């Protein structure tokens, strides 16, 4: 959890963070 381990998954994490937003129950 430093700063280079984000652009490694954070890229798709955002996409998955959009699946939830699209899931605004």
TrEMBL record:
It comes from the Eukaryota. GO terms for biological process: defense response to bacterium. Its main location: secreted. GO terms for cellular component: extracellular region. It is found in: Secreted. Keywords: Antibiotic, Antimicrobial, Coiled coil, Secreted, Signal. Belongs to the pleurocidin family. This is Piscidin-4. It comes from Oreochromis niloticus. The lineage of its organism: Eukaryota, Metazoa, Chordata, Craniata, Vertebrata. The gene is TP4.
């Amino acid at each position: 959890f430093i700063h280079h381990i984000i652009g490694g998954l954070f890229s798709a994490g955002k996409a998955i963070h959009r699946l939830i937003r699209r899931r605004r129950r």
